[PDB]
């Protein structure tokens, strides 16, 4: 089977684990240990082809730069998550983008900008416009998700796999 290696990146509390666990187990998990990194593997039927997705849910604990870079080098695609309710998490996406680009040396690395917590519109700190503008500057797609309601959860994982399939 094709193996699509996806890495979840983003600052703390944005919903990396909640997105991963909603995709894997169809549950909204609100208390997943913030410091725990884990990998998840699932067989999925992508546009009618059975593939395996491997998701690395990062938790920011790896501080040794060579090891972090080694992990990013192994990844084939990235979900770069921020929370629409935390502007600083959106600012932080620039750092993950640069880290990925330094390692992959390919501006067309499969990569989605993911604005999570779309069910908290009344707490929005990041405008759709500014996120779309950043995605346009980077030539990536912007998708808003909710790990709580499941909105666009399958979409971000499937669309990332579609970019891996097309580009690699
Ligand atoms: N309302 C809402 N809460 C969310 C969403 N995603 C995550 N959360 C909550 O935000 C907190 C942090 O989520 P988590 O997935 O652990 O963030 P991580 O540090 O990026 O892995 C938890 O309390 C989750 O319930 C979402 O889409 N909507
Ligand atoms: S490793 O398998 O020993 C490992 C994997 C992931 C982490 S982390 O997610 O806690 N930290 C982190 C930070 C930036 C990029 C990445 Cl891939 N991971 C630790 C150890
Ligand atoms: Ca987490
Ligand atoms: Cl791991």
Curated annotation (Swiss-Prot):
Cell division in keyword set: yes
Reaction(s) catalysed (UniProt annotation): GTP + H2O = GDP + phosphate + H(+)
Mutation effect (residue 41 to W): No effect on interaction with EXOC8
Inducing or repressing factors: Activated in an LPA-dependent manner by LPAR1 and in an LPA-independent manner by LPAR2.
Effect of residue 12 to V: Impaired cytokinesis, as shown by increased number of binucleate cells. No effect on interaction with EXOC2 and EXOC8. No effect on cytokinesis. Decreased interaction with EXOC2 and EXOC8
Any one cellular-component term (Gene Ontology): cleavage furrow
Documented effect of changing residue 36 to E: Strongly reduces interaction with EXOC8
Activity regulation, short description: Alternates between an inactive form bound to GDP and an active form bound to GTP. Activated by a guanine nucleotide-exchange factor (GEF) and inactivated by a GTPase-activating protein (GAP).
Localization in the cell: Cell membrane; Cleavage furrow; Midbody, Midbody ring; Mitochondrion
Motif interval(s): Effector region: 32-40
Binding site for GTP: 13-18, 29-35, 116-119
Impact noted for substituting residue 14 to M: In HINCONS; decreased GTPase activity; decreased RALA effector binding
Any GO molecular function: GTP binding
Keyword set includes Cell cycle: yes
List of glycosylated residues: 35
Outcome of substituting residue 27 to R: Impaired cytokinesis, as shown by increased number of binucleate cells. No effect on cytokinesis. Decreased interaction with EXOC2 and EXOC8
Post-translational modification: Phosphorylated. Prenylation is essential for membrane localization. The geranylgeranylated form and the farnesylated mutant do not undergo alternative prenylation in response to geranylgeranyltransferase I inhibitors (GGTIs) and farnesyltransferase I inhibitors (FTIs).
Highest taxon of source: Eukaryota
Outcome recorded upon mutating residue 35 to A: Abolished monoglucosylation by P.sordellii toxin TcsL
Recorded disease: Hiatt-Neu-Cooper neurodevelopmental syndrome: An autosomal dominant neurodevelopmental disorder characterized by global developmental delay, delayed walking or inability to walk, impaired intellectual development, poor or absent speech, axial hypotonia, and facial dysmorphism. Additional variable features may include seizures, autistic or behavioral abnormalities, and brain abnormalities.
Name of this chain's protein: Ras-related protein Ral-A
